[PDB]
Design an enzyme around this catalytic site. Sequence first.
Site, PDB file in Angstrom:
ATOM      1  N   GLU A  12       0.852  -1.196   0.000  1.00 43.47           N
ATOM      2  CA  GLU A  12       0.000   0.000   0.000  1.00 43.47           C
ATOM      3  C   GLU A  12       0.893   1.253   0.000  1.00 43.47           C
ATOM      4  O   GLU A  12       1.840   1.344   0.770  1.00 43.47           O
ATOM      5  CB  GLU A  12      -0.873   0.013   1.261  1.00 43.47           C
ATOM      6  N   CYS A  59      -5.905   5.158   5.906  1.00 44.06           N
ATOM      7  CA  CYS A  59      -5.601   3.972   5.112  1.00 44.06           C
ATOM      8  C   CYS A  59      -6.782   3.067   4.955  1.00 44.06           C
ATOM      9  O   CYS A  59      -7.453   2.773   5.915  1.00 44.06           O
ATOM     10  CB  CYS A  59      -4.407   3.194   5.676  1.00 44.06           C
ATOM     11  N   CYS A  62      -5.616  -1.307   5.859  1.00 41.03           N
ATOM     12  CA  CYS A  62      -5.981  -1.585   7.228  1.00 41.03           C
ATOM     13  C   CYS A  62      -7.172  -0.616   7.543  1.00 41.03           C
ATOM     14  O   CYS A  62      -7.085   0.246   8.410  1.00 41.03           O
ATOM     15  CB  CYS A  62      -4.824  -1.400   8.227  1.00 41.03           C
ATOM     16  N   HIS A  66      -7.568   2.569  12.368  1.00 37.26           N
ATOM     17  CA  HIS A  66      -7.451   3.921  12.889  1.00 37.26           C
ATOM     18  C   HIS A  66      -8.768   4.427  13.489  1.00 37.26           C
ATOM     19  O   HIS A  66      -8.713   5.323  14.292  1.00 37.26           O
ATOM     20  CB  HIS A  66      -6.947   4.886  11.799  1.00 37.26           C
ATOM     21  N   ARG A 485      -0.478  -4.737  10.906  1.00 41.05           N
ATOM     22  CA  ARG A 485       0.942  -4.484  10.709  1.00 41.05           C
ATOM     23  C   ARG A 485       1.726  -4.208  11.988  1.00 41.05           C
ATOM     24  O   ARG A 485       2.932  -4.193  11.949  1.00 41.05           O
ATOM     25  CB  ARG A 485       1.171  -3.416   9.638  1.00 41.05           C
ATOM     26  N   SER A 508       3.772   0.867  10.361  1.00 45.23           N
ATOM     27  CA  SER A 508       4.738   0.982   9.278  1.00 45.23           C
ATOM     28  C   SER A 508       5.594   2.229   9.491  1.00 45.23           C
ATOM     29  O   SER A 508       6.668   2.266   8.944  1.00 45.23           O
ATOM     30  CB  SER A 508       4.058   1.011   7.905  1.00 45.23           C
ATOM     31  N   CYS A 553       2.787  -0.295   4.546  1.00 49.75           N
ATOM     32  CA  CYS A 553       1.685   0.567   4.194  1.00 49.75           C
ATOM     33  C   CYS A 553       2.149   2.000   4.442  1.00 49.75           C
ATOM     34  O   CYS A 553       2.359   2.401   5.589  1.00 49.75           O
ATOM     35  CB  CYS A 553       0.460   0.218   5.050  1.00 49.75           C
ATOM     36  N   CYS A 556      -0.436   4.565   5.812  1.00 47.86           N
ATOM     37  CA  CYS A 556      -0.375   4.511   7.276  1.00 47.86           C
ATOM     38  C   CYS A 556       0.883   5.163   7.841  1.00 47.86           C
ATOM     39  O   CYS A 556       0.824   5.894   8.835  1.00 47.86           O
ATOM     40  CB  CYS A 556      -0.339   3.061   7.734  1.00 47.86           C
TER      41      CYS A 556
END
Lengths: 559, 268
Positions: A12, A59, A62, A66, A485, A508, A553, A556
């Site tokens: 991503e 994002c 995922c 968040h 992640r 990430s 990602c 992210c």
Amino acid sequence: ERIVVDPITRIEGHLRIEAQMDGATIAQAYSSGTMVRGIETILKGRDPRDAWAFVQRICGVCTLVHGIASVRAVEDALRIELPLNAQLIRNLMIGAQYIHDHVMHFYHLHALDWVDVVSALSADPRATSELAQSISAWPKSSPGYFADTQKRIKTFVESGQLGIFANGYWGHPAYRLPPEANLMAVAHYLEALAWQRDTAKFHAIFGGKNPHPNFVVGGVPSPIDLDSDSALNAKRLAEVRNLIQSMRTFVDQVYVPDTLAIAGFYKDWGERGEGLGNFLCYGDLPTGASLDPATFLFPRGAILDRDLSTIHEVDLEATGEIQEFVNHSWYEYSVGNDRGLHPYEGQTNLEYDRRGGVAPPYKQLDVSDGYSWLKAPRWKGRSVEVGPLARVLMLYATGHDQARELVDSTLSRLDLPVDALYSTLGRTAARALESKILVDAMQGWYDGLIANVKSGDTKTFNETLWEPSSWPSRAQGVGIMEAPRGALGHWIVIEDGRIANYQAVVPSTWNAGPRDGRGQAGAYEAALQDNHQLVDVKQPIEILRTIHSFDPCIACAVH
Amino acid sequence: ARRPSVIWLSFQECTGCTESLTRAHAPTLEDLILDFISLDYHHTLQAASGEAAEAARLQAMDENRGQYLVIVDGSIPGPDANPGFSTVAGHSNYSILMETVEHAAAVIAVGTCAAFGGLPQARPNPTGAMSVMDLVRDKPVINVPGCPPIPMVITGVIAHYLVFGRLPELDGYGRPLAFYGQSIHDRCYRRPFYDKGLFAESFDDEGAKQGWCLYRLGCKGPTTYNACATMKWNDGTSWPVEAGHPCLGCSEPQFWDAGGFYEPVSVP
Ligand code: SF4
Ligand code: SF4
Ligand code: F3S
Ligand SMILES: [Cl-]
Ligand SMILES: [Mg+2]
């Protein structure tokens, strides 16, 4: 000078790797995020109850995570306790997100590093069926099915419009699977796309849609009323039950056995791609209503120097513990660009030019100062790795019985020692194993929801602190989560009903973030620096295998 | 050439729009990719990385000149913003946008960010983000907004274009009428409750459990145009108001800056 891979695809977002080569050996690697939005800055001044909807859009791979970290940050700041049904529903949605996200990472993002699609065209359909059947009970294994799948891919490749397969690295010596295993993985790649879009209905039931389901501060927006046409009732709950069962079946019968069968041909990837030795978890997934780390399925803690005998405690609020540095990031800190900021005091002032960002069109970063849109998070000054490997190590270290059994039986099947966990292979294996652990847990949370509703508690939302006039005029809190992640935190500071600061530090960000003031590399960079050789710099499949194993990602990481 | 060429550009996106596309049940992404289009560049899925990936986009543009479709996901920092805010292979998104659309047959801006500016453009817009239609004027542009749009709206628009050989009819903001022609509030199953004065006052009071209207909790359905209330999401499973949350307005320009999500507007 440096070898450049930009774009990294099958992640991503927007990632560039530069590598200083010494012969065929990677001598130094540099990880650079090449897109920023500045969502933290967008939030300032807004209503904390709205934050989740903004930061969810950090994002959409995922998705959910968040939103969850955000409403938890607000609930932490304000001390709102959730009702039990809300907490169970959140656990269920989190488990559904892990399973969806890991299965698609493995097939749709990672597997083309290990699986040669051109070689699948040579497979015997019957042998492919014998192999599939020697590993799994999954129904869809007939020779005619493999022959029909192979023929569709063969017509595609022969049309001369190779689409996403064009200029691929097919026939590279790093590819080791027999034609049969390649054809099997390609068929499973296609089944995983049909399975994933069915699985996504789970978030739509509770959250209205996927991607990007809805959340609320203080509970879940979906009410429960067995006697209603517009609430969760026996009919909706029956659909949820069937979705959990198809999740279980696909993990047990397709994803985990494919990961193990493929690993057997790449056991030397158990010897590279982990150069830090330190792992961090915030923990997640409480058994009950309260977000109490003692009840977590994934425990909170840190491992240093690969030592599984000591779990160090983690404090989300100690200002000397979690800090983000910008010594090699495109940001300006008013306290000085060599200082680390704890996220309650984080700052997001974008500065490309003055931090050495190179004007497009360019061929090389300048790595002497800022070389990334990622901040560099450190835990007490250490570079750490987060994500499935950190979690599986934490579970192992703390005596989780099922994790111990899965890790032991995996290493034993592969004939590998415990130190092969610390590697690109072990990380990829950890992702699959923790999927099995989560998918088994789903039934317990579902049954606990049904029992709670059956006993007469249909509450889903704690309204008591919903109105801003009920809040203290100063509050601050942190929302933690174990996202697929790795460890995710949102630190919020609230003044007079408004967001005064909001800082996200995202998995990430930790793994992909660049060097700090001591020249200490981040996880991706130290991983590539650990025992990598490239056969061919124009087809850097070895870089991709290791980078993809972290499931990067960058939307992210940078936000 | 023989399946029509499609180039997918990903700029300041969160990848929600691509995930949404993979959700669609008919036609599925795999049936499209094998049978209906030639998806020649797409970061999320591309086997090759680096220059091999860039060479595939350029060769698509070379061989299908005048004929390829460009789909853009995400806002683009405009030509007055620092070219370093968002780059791919050392070039700015703005440079890649203008060079790739120059010989496209048409461009679809998928998602509210590409269509209208979306999240990166919300106040105070730190990266000078802009939308496709503001930057690209000499090309047919179809806006397919939503955060993300409904999966079968994305493939619906694509199937319309491929099967019927034309652009859908558009409203004044470039949105296909089949999907964006009616407001949420003019189709919403809670609407007759709204008109009777029956409203939820929290997420799980009697009105919430009974499907009374969410207007008092901030619902922006009255000024939002999307198919959620009729087509619904994820193969007809549910949609935001059916699952108990107010519509955020997520397919409208500047919806992030419309006052709080949980505040009613000042009238209708
Ligand atoms: S519209 Fe929403 S879902 Fe699509 S790129 Fe913009 S932020 Fe992501
Ligand atoms: S305000 Fe929202 S919930 Fe109420 S009828 Fe209109 S669209 Fe439906
Ligand atoms: S928030 Fe968006 S998804 Fe539909 S119901 Fe409202 S337009
Ligand atoms: Cl859909
Ligand atoms: Mg941050």
